[PDB]
Amino acid sequence: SMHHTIARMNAFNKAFANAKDCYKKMQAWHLLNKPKHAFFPMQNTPALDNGLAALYELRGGKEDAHILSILSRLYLYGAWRNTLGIYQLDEEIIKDCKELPDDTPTSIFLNLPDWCVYVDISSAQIATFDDGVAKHIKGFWAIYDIVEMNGINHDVLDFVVDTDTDDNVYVPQPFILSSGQSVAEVLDYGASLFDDDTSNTLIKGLLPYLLWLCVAEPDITYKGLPVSREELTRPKHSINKKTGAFVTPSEPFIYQIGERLGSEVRRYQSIIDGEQKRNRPPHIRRGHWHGYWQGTGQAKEFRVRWQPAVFVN
Template identity: 30%
Template sequence: MTLRPLAHLNQTSRQFGKIWHNVDIFRQAKGTDLPNWPSWCFLPMAAWVAIASEGAEFGSVEMLQAASDASRLAAIGTWRYTQGIYRFDEYLAEALTETRLDGKIPTDLLLRLPEWCVYVETPRQEWCGATLYGFWAHVEHDINDARPELRFLLDTEKGLIPQILHIGPWTIDEAISRWAREAEKEAMQMGLMFSSGRAEFIRTCTLAIQPLLSMVLYLCSEEPELKDRNFPDHGVCLPKAKRTKRGWRLFPPAKPRIWSVGQHTGDILRRGCNKQAVERNFRPHLRRAHWHGYWSGPRDGERKFSFKWLPPVVVGWKVYEEETSTP
């Protein structure tokens, strides 16, 4: 059985015959014929729109369709060059998705995705009432104003649905609001109506995106538990371009890599759910992700107060293990 993200990739390749050749052209023009962009962005959305439109005029039906196709191309096309599929341990996934994300979004952390684009499987999730099989996540660098955006492409039973967060020093609902205002402005420029900036829409999207954002943040944490069972000694790494007659090019892997995420942490949480742990009140748990404020610099010199994002961690296991291992 073909993996879902691979099936979508094959369909995209059939639909857009010249897409990978055009990706090479845009990547080779980075910093020369085109403005430069950060290394954490594979290819800006403006390039994907140009690839999808193939020279269509602004405001035309073809351009409107290209703008719609670009979100799908950006996620699936970027994922093609790494093809990482991330399978979270179900106990860790449950604990992460139940963790509320309050306060400002840790933008710098989100720029540390293990790959340019990841596909996360979500067999027990829904999106606004529809089954959510998984999602792609990647970070976009807006060429016009250098704005970073965390872009999701949701793989649902009702089709592929894009969801965008304008990430910065603000909350999730503000990130959704900023995207909605920008989408409304762009729709008006194209003569379309977009009325999703209402409070109910913001609230619904904020609640729905939090579990997915928690999983992405875990992948971006300092030492996420990632393991490829087929190649346990090989970690995640980005591909390197190769010199060809057509210039420097990136080549996709032969097949996707399946990454087990958080297996050790999940085992701890699973074992902590047994009856003895609960009765003795030593059940380990996941400390919620939170901000930590700290001072840095010499005590007798200029000091700086900073906030650091601390991902969820398992606590209480050492005490529990000592108690339950006693004969």
């Protein structure tokens, strides 16, 4: 009855007793530096705890992945606990999600509602593979970041895979948006300053599910009722005017995406089945992400939208 992400975050906060302190510091940095897209840069995470910096600046800091685990989860939870958004994608939509068109602008992934969203795609039956160890992907966090490749600050989108395991690898995977380049350019042809490739292919795979939160006209429902993108970007966290402290949600806001569409598809399949149950002497054309460019006003833009499933009878 309590989501696994919340349970694991609550566990972390308990086991690393300095967690609440670090979030407050992050909050302080946020309010002062007023970042436009991110909430708190990953780079700055050594500052939050002094013991972590002391153990991270020994030879063995970038070698110890447990410290990087701590820092990654501080960076992630600190941004995520202010909104606690969980977006469950519908079956009949997850299936039709395949890789996006390769010239989609990165810029459209600057349109997330919150600083960090958790996307639930366990109905995709996608797994993650590492050295003989295969793990089912329950979901993933998309969280913003501001990074410094020296002298320059870029807008990066980080992905954190959730496999619901004790040894989950929470180390964020970056995907630079600040460039004018499309998804293909960055991810595919290695133009990014991040060239790890395994991470880049993993990100590309994640992209088609994350797109729903960046569309101008989302099928988001909260508890069965439509959410306008206007209402979705409304603030959740409350800031105290005298103290400066943050008031955060006690429970997550679990949304559903593509549920009208899913129901429609379920009903189409129901007609097919009914026809086959009465045997008298009728198919679904699957939906898909569709990309195109209006290319008007001289400014070149690439538009992607969901082309829905269609009952062909």
